RNA sequence: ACGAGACUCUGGCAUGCUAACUAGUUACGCGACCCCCGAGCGGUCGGCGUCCCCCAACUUCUUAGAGGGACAAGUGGCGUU
């Protein structure tokens, strides 16, 4: 039994989540906790989307552990989703044939492109003369 | 009297197909380099829906991949890129086993020796470097190799004295002697830059081509100009049939086959049915290769496609 | 697999009765999502917000006023509770109720103003389907917001009542009254 | 104890600024151009660049021997760590500070404003500069102040190339009725070496080489050597 | 044989990298064991001031910025060879500190 | 198939641990628990009179997850936003005399011990108790 | 807007005049030739010049140009 | 010819290069706890070794250097084409 594993990262505004995926039985954990114990649970389906789209059969041969850092809660969740999807695709590319990777990538991309491609948006700098990047202080005459 | 008929098409790339490599050991697999920084190993099924599907992607190059060549036993692969480095991959696991560094410009061509113990590489640095398997550049040539870019470098598979042939953008075809690495022969017949040079399996004839559109056949052992065959716009690739005594040239829109005994065209390969797309230029034929079986031509095009042509005997 | 909003509301049975608005309401198979929260970039290009699912558009338009800007999780919760209340009250798919409410709320003919700051004179014009959808969503959210203010009644209940009345066509809803008044003024400005 | 790197670099900058100000006030008459401090653990060397070194050195080296004293007195670091050297500028026409001082001392002698400005402009252009600008502002004639402007050659105003292609100098001169202000701008020429000009070219200047002569091939020739 | 750390601090990166390359090449020409150069995070000091010497006009601000770059090199060697290689290293603008841990 | 603390829901785990500590009866409770508020940004005293047990359970859980926390760290953990009249709100820390007494009481139960580097950490007995509580919580969640 | 300033156009026209043989319809080969023959101190300026050279070569292949 | 553009800093991409105990990852040992109905190639560990006599490898994640990358380049329309 060779030691085959892949580490992939996903990003949101400042949040970075790195998923390590190796041969296993189907364990998926984030920071040591199960997927269903991550907060907030309002956006729980956003975290279960890749599994629901691909099924437990494709995840049944791998163990995945995610470490998240930075950003906010929503950004961390969106980073975790992308890290999971990219890690599974990268594992299938290396240790399975190319056809399975193509199928998985097509299924993921059709539903949502951000599962595999990062969002480049970042906060804009403040400029003097106003509260923020675009807004200006109240002008007065007379 | 043979007709070449399009059999199928392979679609796995996102960029221009730049080189196609075959091997006698494994007839069922092909290796194709492309401009998407990826080298695709194709597994041939010869099925109804798909003639072949991609099997494994070799991705370690930051820039375009220019040339790819398989080893004698078909177990390793060699590749040059525009990032200035060469890569030696294990085809079994799809991992880079060796890296060759030392070029300061894009590496345009790379060639394996007949014993898989010598490696040659020509760069846009106007430099020809000779390396071993371990990755050490044994000898670099700055002896006025070319005043311009070096397009292609090839080894001569002949029982006689080993020979390396190169073509330059300075309109010259140079012939160097192996194991001593000295300039042996110069050939000045072209009007324009050169793209490809190839050697017949006998090791006696060589073909040179470029922008001028004329494929010039020279004699290697004796060192004289033999023939000149007119072609299309630009000659991208030149190949010899291992068992049929043919010369296949890859022009932009079409592919030409010449019989060297009669100097007569055997076939021209091109197809397009849509009338609306006639305004746009047809995709160019970039790469060309013969299967060791001798019955299928593999042609890589600008259209991000690889087309297979089957010989039909009449 | 079958994708259902919030895990329980299917989208296959929903159908749109207006041919004009079919291309601007996204509720169908390729627009079926689990949650009305995607963090998508729909405002980057013109007409791109017609590809945004209509539930997410309602959620976006419910983050008012300025004391509620950016609180999108509370809005998702409000929408979930409102859909639950709608299903309990009517007994049908809340997505169909939302589609009917948006169809009925959108004004069909408007009046464009030519105004010298005090006096204003107007002329009747037509309304594009995208503006119809936008104005319907705005009117529904405004009606729910004004209903919930200074009253012992959850915002979800008020939103459910507004949607039910708008889908029914009853005049008890804010959106229907506003649409009727706008169309009456447009008719009188012919 | 010791201080942090931020404070250390800020202190070095402040020391260099004060040293330059003191040297300017002391050696304006001698065409003082600049100061360069090379710090070595053995000794800290100070190179004084000025048009003429005879006045800076003084007779038998007295005056410079005074300066290296007061510096040691001022900043307090121990004796034997001070050593001043005087080096003449390679080309005095391409230095804006030296030309501003020359114009100031020509005006102080009673020379006409226009004649002195034109002489400085001609000398700068003859030195090899791409262009030059000289502005003199104040009560040149009468109770009402004005400004005279003398320009020649090329000149760039906006962008990053201004930082390394333009040399600027601002000076004040006290005449009987008040202060006159002098501004001098010099545009350096492009020099492949870094001696008298910027090494890098202007960003938008593209130099296309002329192709070499090529012999037209007629007949295929094979040459073996 | 000492574990010796060389810390290089500079304001411009070209001179700093030139000095680091010179030190690495010199040390490796003596067949020594070198670690690094490891680059510390760049420090950015900022001063925001008003342009006007008085309080009249539009409120415009100048943003002055200074950047400090830091490198570390590790050497397993006696003191004498380190001073041999270091003597050449003197460069204008770069502060070199040699310590024995 | 062994349940650990990270597997179960944290709020239910805190409730169960607080109930276990209260039922044990060996926890030491200060005299002034009924007359104090837990921070200076609080307006009122805590609603639940048995708040000391809940705070002790929360502190034990935090020491389980991240060991070596002192009085200042616990004070920062339980800090919150302070509204001050017509001025903008600001972050404010908790009371030190509550955190210190909670830590001392947990040390009196042989569940918390002094850390070598500084602060406090859990004893193997405390870890065993927390894992047992987590197993009970998981069993109760799954059975129902 | 994507209008090219006269610097790019002048450089492209001079390059096409002097080195018409070496150029073609490929942007990347053209940008590799331009850095070989011409001195452009910027990467973006070189890319703009190469991109205009490719367009001008296509126009020349279509037919004669006014310039 | 100046201004505009070009230019400088900044934000996005690199599983390609350079190399790090004042950054880490993975793996392997020790230890604590849980499940004796599945006790295990089991789970959790911001708990301790693995550079410094000898006791692991490697930069994905962190830092910052050198380079690449985008040019309205490809296709289809509209334009004096
Ligand atoms: Mg902000
Ligand atoms: Mg803000
Ligand atoms: Mg209310
Ligand atoms: Mg300009
Ligand atoms: Mg500008
Ligand atoms: Mg808090
Ligand atoms: Mg308040
Ligand atoms: Mg990295």
From Swiss-Prot, chain A:
The modification N6-acetyllysine is found at residue 56. It comes from the Eukaryota. One of its GO terms (cellular component) is cytosolic small ribosomal subunit. GO terms for biological process: cellular response to leukemia inhibitory factor; cytoplasmic translation; maturation of SSU-rRNA from tricistronic rRNA transcript (SSU-rRNA, 5.8S rRNA, LSU-rRNA); ribosomal small subunit biogenesis; rRNA processing; translation. It holds the Pfam family Ribosomal_S9. InterPro entries: Ribosomal_Su5_D2-typ_SF, Ribosomal_uS9, Ribosomal_uS9_CS, Ribsml_uS5_D2-typ_fold_subgr. It is found in: Cytoplasm; Nucleus, Nucleolus. One of its GO terms (molecular function) is RNA binding. Keywords: Acetylation, Cytoplasm, Nucleus, Phosphoprotein, Ribonucleoprotein, Ribosomal protein. Component of the small ribosomal subunit. Part of the small subunit (SSU) processome, composed of more than 70 proteins and the RNA chaperone small nucleolar RNA (snoRNA) U3. Belongs to the universal ribosomal protein uS9 family. This is Small ribosomal subunit protein uS9.
Swiss-Prot record, chain C:
Gene3D superfamilies: Ribosomal protein S7 domain. One of its GO terms (molecular function) is RNA binding. It comes from the Eukaryota. The modification Phosphoserine is found at residue 128. It is found in: Cytoplasm; Nucleus, Nucleolus. InterPro entries: Ribosomal_uS7 (IPR000235), Ribosomal_uS7_CS (IPR020606), Ribosomal_uS7_dom (IPR023798), Ribosomal_uS7_dom_sf (IPR036823), Ribosomal_uS7_euk/arc (IPR005716). Its main location: cytoplasm. Belongs to the universal ribosomal protein uS7 family. This is Small ribosomal subunit protein uS7. It comes from Homo sapiens. The gene is RPS5.
From Swiss-Prot, chain E:
GO terms for biological process: cytoplasmic translation; positive regulation of signal transduction by p53 class mediator; translation. The modification Phosphoserine is found at residue 77. Coiled coil: none annotated. The modification N6-acetyllysine is found at residues 18, 59. Keywords: Acetylation, Cytoplasm, Isopeptide bond, Phosphoprotein, Ribonucleoprotein, Ribosomal protein, Ubl conjugation. It comes from the Eukaryota. GO terms for cellular component: cytoplasm; cytosol; cytosolic ribosome; cytosolic small ribosomal subunit; extracellular exosome; membrane; nucleoplasm; synapse. The keyword Transcription does not apply. The keyword Cytoplasm applies. It is found in: Cytoplasm. Polyubiquitinated by ZNF598 via 'Lys-63'-linked ubiquitin chains when a ribosome has stalled, initiating the ribosome quality control (RQC) pathway to degrade the potentially detrimental aberrant nascent polypeptide. Deubiquitinated by OTUD3 and USP21, antagonizing ZNF598 activity. Ufmylated by UFL1. One of its GO terms (molecular function) is RNA binding. Component of the 40S small ribosomal subunit. Belongs to the universal ribosomal protein uS10 family. Component of the small ribosomal subunit. The ribosome is a large ribonucleoprotein complex responsible for the synthesis of proteins in the cell. This is Small ribosomal subunit protein uS10. It comes from Homo sapiens.
Swiss-Prot record, chain G:
Belongs to the eukaryotic ribosomal protein eS17 family. This is Small ribosomal subunit protein eS17. It comes from the Eukaryota. It is found in: Cytoplasm; Nucleus, Nucleolus. The modification N6-succinyllysine is found at residue 18. Component of the small ribosomal subunit. The ribosome is a large ribonucleoprotein complex responsible for the synthesis of proteins in the cell. Part of the small subunit (SSU) processome, first precursor of the small eukaryotic ribosomal subunit. During the assembly of the SSU processome in the nucleolus, many ribosome biogenesis factors, an RNA chaperone and ribosomal proteins associate with the nascent pre-rRNA and work in concert to generate RNA folding, modifications, rearrangements and cleavage as well as targeted degradation of pre-ribosomal RNA by the RNA exosome. It is linked to Diamond-Blackfan anemia 4: A form of Diamond-Blackfan anemia, a congenital non-regenerative hypoplastic anemia that usually presents early in infancy. Diamond-Blackfan anemia is characterized by a moderate to severe macrocytic anemia, erythroblastopenia, and an increased risk of developing leukemia. 30 to 40% of Diamond-Blackfan anemia patients present with short stature and congenital anomalies, the most frequent being craniofacial (Pierre-Robin syndrome and cleft palate), thumb and urogenital anomalies. The chain holds residues 2 to 68 of 135 of the full protein.
